[PDB]
């Protein structure tokens, strides 16, 4: 008999709501929990694991294991570009399919650093030096090694240590960016050049390959849960 007054939003169904409902089966005993390894409590932990990135995604290479490999060789020249791609993990084709890119497609905003690990896959006798570099937005993608040096760069020397890590620092005006392509929140440009020519001895291949691994740092977050475009369905299975 308590007087009550309903408010706008009664008898409505919001998919994302948190209410209590009656149990279809009362007093039901569920199976006791068992210890299973690799328990996940947050999506970010998955996104912090290195994922192989296919930089050479061109032509029919995406249908072969050649998309992931990156070609390098001995050339009578210096300052040439090994590769180049923009900082768009959510939108760029290169990162759209990585463990990081796959997870970044269920969220709208993303803010944090990105780690790029490059592993030389040449012979023990093969030696070389590259210039990994990241260039800020508002400047045209560097076209020569002189221009690229101006921005954040790391001289990498081939050595007993197989891989060198390039850590892209978070340099943005706003606190967050957009996973979808957006001109206002431009990320930046990542390029690699030859600091020194690859040098090999006789009876040794002068053509090698490199592998790229992209993971997130300890200051990476995402927001606004949204659906992933990738998965499509016209009828039920």
């Amino acid at each position: 008999g308590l007087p009550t007054m309903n408010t706008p939003g009664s008898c409505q169904f919001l998919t994302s709501d948190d209410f209590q409902s009656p149990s279809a089966m009362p007093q039901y005993d569920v199976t006791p929990e068992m210890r299973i390894p690799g328990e996940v409590k947050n999506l970010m932990e998955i996104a912090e694991v290195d994922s192989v990135v296919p930089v050479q995604n061109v032509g029919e290479k995406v249908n072969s294991m050649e998309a992931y490999q990156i070609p390098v060789r001995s050339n009578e020249g210096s300052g040439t570009q090994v590769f180049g791609f923009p900082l768009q993990p959510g939108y760029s084709s290169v990162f759209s399919r990585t463990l990081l890119g796959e997870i970044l497609n269920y969220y709208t905003h993303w803010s944090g650093s990105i780690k790029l690990t490059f592993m030389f896959c040449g012979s023990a006798m093969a030696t070389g030096k590259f210039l990994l570099a990241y260039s800020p937005p508002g400047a045209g993608a560097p076209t020569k090694r002189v221009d690229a040096m101006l921005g954040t760069h790391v001289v990498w020397d081939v050595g007993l240590q197989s891989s060198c890590v390039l850590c892209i620092p978070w340099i943005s005006q706003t606190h967050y960016r957009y996973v979808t392509s957006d001109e206002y929140t431009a990320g930046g440009f990542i390029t690699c050049w030859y600091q020194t020519n690859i040098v090999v001895p006789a009876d040794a291949q002068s053509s090698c390959y490199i592998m790229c691994f992209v993971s997130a740092c300890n200051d990476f977050s995402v927001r606004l849960l949204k659906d992933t475009p990738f998965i499509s369905q016209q009828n039920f299975f």
């Binding site: 998919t15 995604n57 923009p86 650093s113 890590v165």
Partner: protein, 268 residues
């Protein structure tokens, strides 16, 4: 919350954090300060929305079917399985084993079919939804004796009211549901590969309690599955190609990713 950036100064030393080995399978975990000069920053960002409970706890339409108040088809039967809809399914397939509580919400709408019937008077339509456990008897016809629902949970809903909602506790003979089963049900390995006695919940039956009107009426029922108190184990790579059959992970070979004009290209 997240880690705060630490201020650093130019350093010349034998220490080489950037140089490492990826063969060890160990993530480098190198902060920005190791390779460049940074300024102390007090980050206030929090990883709240990236949690599995926040990621998987949303209502997603898994299956919609229709029935009539007359004609051959008078009732609709669907077995509980989340592989019917690609969206919710892909999110669930992210891990190998998931244990969670289930919340069911049903949206029912009735549409009048074209007919030559005249003087049609419609009475508020009442719909009955009955849940049948595995091994329970299934109704042969709309006017069958099974609809008594003595020991079978059932819900009666009248049009113009908020959608019916019930909460189901985790049901699995095994400790946790298995998204992917590698093997055969038969000890002789002569059966459908990947079939498991696990993940079997029940069957849902929906019918019109009363005809309501002389003229024909068709109603479509949509089932929504919202996971609750979810737990995840063994993370795996997300689906790359479109789902063909719910029963088997059968797929069509798909390009690793989209192509670009050439390497060194900043656009798609």
């Amino acid at each position: 919350r997240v880690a705060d950036t630490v201020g650093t100064g130019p350093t010349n030393s034998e220490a080489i954090p950037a140089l490492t080995a990826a063969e060890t399978g160990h993530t480098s975990q190198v902060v920005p300060g190791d390779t460049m000069q940074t300024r102390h920053v007090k980050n206030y960002h929090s990883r709240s929305e990236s949690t599995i409970e926040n990621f998987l706890c949303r209502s997603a339409c898994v299956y919609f079917t229709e029935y009539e108040n007359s004609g051959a088809k008078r009732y609709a039967e669907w077995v509980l399985t989340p592989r019917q809809a690609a969206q919710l399914r892909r999110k669930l397939e992210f891990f190998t084993y998931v244990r969670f509580d289930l919340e069911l919400t049903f949206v029912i709408t009735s549409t009048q079919q074209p007919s030559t019937t005249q003087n049609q008077d419609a009475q508020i339509l009442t719909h009955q939804i009955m849940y049948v456990p595995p091994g329970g008897p299934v109704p042969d016809k709309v006017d069958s004796y099974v609809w008594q629902t003595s020991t079978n949970p059932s819900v009666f809903w009248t049009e113009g009211n908020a959608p019916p909602r019930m909460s189901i506790p985790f049901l699995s003979i095994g400790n946790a549901y298995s998204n992917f089963y590698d093997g055969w049900s038969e000890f002789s390995r002569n059966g459908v590969y990947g079939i498991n006695t696990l993940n079997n919940m029940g069957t849902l039956y929906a019918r019109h309690v009363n005809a309501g009107s002389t003229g024909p009426i068709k109603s479509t029922i949509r089932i929504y599955f919202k996971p609750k108190h979810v737990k995840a184990w063994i993370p795996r790579p997300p689906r790359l190609c479109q789902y063909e059959k719910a029963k088997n992970v059968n797929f069509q070979p798909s390009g690793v990713t989209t192509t670009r004009q050439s390497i060194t290209t900043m656009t798609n």
